[PDB]
């Protein structure tokens, strides 16, 4: 059977997702996460449709940029595999932790 080497399909995905703009997290699961979190600050809250979309657009852009910095941290340690220590390093240096 035909089998692509480890890494070859990942490079394809990167090229594929860096070219597109669609959101990469399914909308309903995200909308559920949003509602439960808000419920802890005020109950019986309704959300405009655009309101939830703004939160997804912001969260995804935030996570995407964080992975960029996380990637540099892993590459800095002479790796090509991101790990928790890479995300932590990036957040610490950003001034988030």
């Amino acid at each position: 059977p035909h089998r692509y080497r480890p890494g070859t399909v990942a490079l394809r995905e990167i090229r594929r997702y860096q070219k597109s703009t669609e959101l990469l997290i399914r909308k309903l699961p995200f909308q559920r996460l949003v509602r439960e979190i808000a419920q802890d600050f005020k109950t019986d809250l309704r959300f405009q449709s655009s309101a939830v979309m703004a939160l997804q657009e912001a969260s995804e852009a935030y996570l995407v940029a964080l992975f960029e910095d996380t990637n540099l941290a892993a590459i800095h340690a002479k790796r090509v595999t991101i790990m928790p220590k890479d995300i932590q390093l990036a957040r610490r240096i950003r001034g988030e932790r």
Binding site: Y17, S50, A51, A54, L63, F67, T70, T81, I87
Partner: protein, 79 residues
């Protein structure tokens, strides 16, 4: 759970858009925590603007103003 609704595949897609090629098994749980903290800080501020205006509906503007004060200005929703 709800945070668990943010799937391994989606998290990998995000990473891919971020230029990541190889991902550690532990990254998925680390990312969920990061995403949860991000949303709590943004949603907390939004709801606060919502409570201030005496509404029971979080508006796009409430989110945009929360993102702006968190230093993460967003364009395209009333900014």
């Amino acid at each position: 759970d709800n945070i668990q609704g943010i799937t391994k595949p989606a998290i990998r897609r995000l990473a891919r858009r971020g230029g990541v090629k190889r991902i550690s098994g532990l990254i998925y749980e680390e990312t969920r925590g990061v995403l949860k903290v991000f949303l709590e800080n943004v949603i907390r501020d939004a709801v606060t603007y919502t409570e201030h205006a005496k509404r029971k509906t979080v508006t796009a503007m409430d989110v945009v103003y929360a993102l702006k004060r968190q230093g993460r200005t967003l364009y395209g929703f009333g900014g």
